[PDB]
């Protein structure tokens, strides 16, 4: 159950820019930050976790200054490095608390859809993907001691705390379960068969076609899609000539008892 803080910054021209963020806790979006609004918006009641109104207010401030700060830094590097608008900067950082051992953390950032640099240890570092003129930007970002310090305190000393506060305050929901409805269908022609499953949670699931107690590969699993309920949907399929066969579904809602269908 990792906490993923995602940031999306798009610079149209040197004139116009919007920057929105969100916080995923495992597979559940918890927070969302809008460019327009000043305050971060909690999506779940257990969002603020164990933190106080105070502890939270501090943190919110930090982001407020950051968002602006960050935005200008880019627009400046643009001038400094001769980059060309439009630009698309993304950022994905956070941590995952282990009950047994210490928690790990990560701070990645990508430019124009490509890993560019990350924060590891006590500084910044360029990805193997980023060109040799990025060393510049890195040299600059690293000159800044105070930020680096703060960044660390967040990964090793803040995120983790806020995560254990969530795990607790969210314990009950993360443990919820939802049995999915299942059914079969004909579908488009190669005659391919379809096995649909919809309305479940958590995300992990197991769906496969099989003609006997011993299943078979060649079952093409679709992609796991969402519903406004945070529930998921899934289509597993197979191509054949050979009529009789069945579909099975293994999940944690249908505890102990999987689901089977025929034809």
């Amino acid at each position, epitope marked *: 159950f990792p906490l993923r803080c995602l940031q999306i910054s798009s610079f149209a021209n040197s004139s116009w820019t919007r920057t929105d963020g969100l916080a995923w806790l495992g597979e559940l979006q918890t927070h969302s930050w809008s460019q327009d609004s000043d305050t971060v918006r909690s999506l779940k009641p257990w969002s603020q976790g164990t933190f106080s109104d105070q502890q939270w207010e501090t943190l919110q401030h930090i982001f407020r200054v950051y968002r602006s*700060s960050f935005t200008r830094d880019v627009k400046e590097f643009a001038k400094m490095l001769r980059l060309s608008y439009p630009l698309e900067l993304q950022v994905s950082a956070g941590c995952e608390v282990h009950p047994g051992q210490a928690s790990n953390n990560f701070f990645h950032v990508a430019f124009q859809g490509k890993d560019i640099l990350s924060f590891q240890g006590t500084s910044w570092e360029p990805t193997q993907e980023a060109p040799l003129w990025v060393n510049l930007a890195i040299q*600059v970002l690293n*000159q800044d001691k105070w930020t680096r310090e703060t960044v660390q305190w967040l990964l090793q000393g803040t995120c983790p705390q806020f995560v254990s506060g969530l795990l607790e305050s969210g314990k009950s929901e993360l443990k919820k379960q939802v049995k999915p409805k299942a059914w079969l269908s004909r579908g488009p022609s190669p005659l391919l068969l379809v096995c649909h499953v919809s309305g479940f949670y958590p995300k992990p699931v197991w769906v496969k076609w099989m003609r006997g107690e011993q299943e078979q590969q060649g079952t093409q699993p679709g992609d796991i899609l969402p519903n406004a309920d945070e529930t998921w949907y899934l289509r597993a399929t197979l191509d054949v000539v050979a009529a009789g066969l069945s579909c099975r579904v293994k999940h944690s809602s249908l505890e102990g008892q999987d689901i089977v269908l025929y034809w």
Partner: T-cell receptor
Amino acid sequence: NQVEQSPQSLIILEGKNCTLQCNYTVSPFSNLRWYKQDTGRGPVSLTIMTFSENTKSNGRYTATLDADTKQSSLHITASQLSDSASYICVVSDRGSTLGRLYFGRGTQLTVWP
Amino acid sequence: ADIYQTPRYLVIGTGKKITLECSQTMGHDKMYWYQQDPGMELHLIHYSYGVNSTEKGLSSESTVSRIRTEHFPLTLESARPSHTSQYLCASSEEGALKESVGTQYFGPGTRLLVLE
């Protein structure tokens, strides 16, 4: 304005002391500078202060920095006529070349003999 | 100190092309151009991170060309009374490596007077 200075102006006899004030709301904070600009001349840099330092002494000038309250003051010991000038408070938001500068309207100091 | 400006005084008619020369003997990469109205504070009009770097700071009709480290000439295509003011040139030791962003160094300044 993000940087306010006080007092606006003051007059003092030579040999006496004085203390110029500076209060900023700039954020984030990187460092604080004090410039002395004589009549019809270039602003000259007296002292630079990072938040890790609360004191930077140059000649009869000593500048103190309190990052908490976000204010700085500049003490002048044994004032002499050459001290008559505009004293500017300058604040930087970044600890890098990536930093914008904010200048105060300045304090006008005149030293009478 | 090691930074230069010329001329210190200039009075010129409207529409005439002006350029304010600025040169540093120090190897400073970052340079600034300020405009200081009498009694007012320092206004940032142009700045440069290094050769070929020219960025606008207030939007003025002025232009800044940096084809070389030691030179940072400021030019006005067409003069106008509104341009009347003192123009200061500065360079910082900012950048590279130190336990602090290099302090600023200013020039003697140039007071231009534009008339009809």
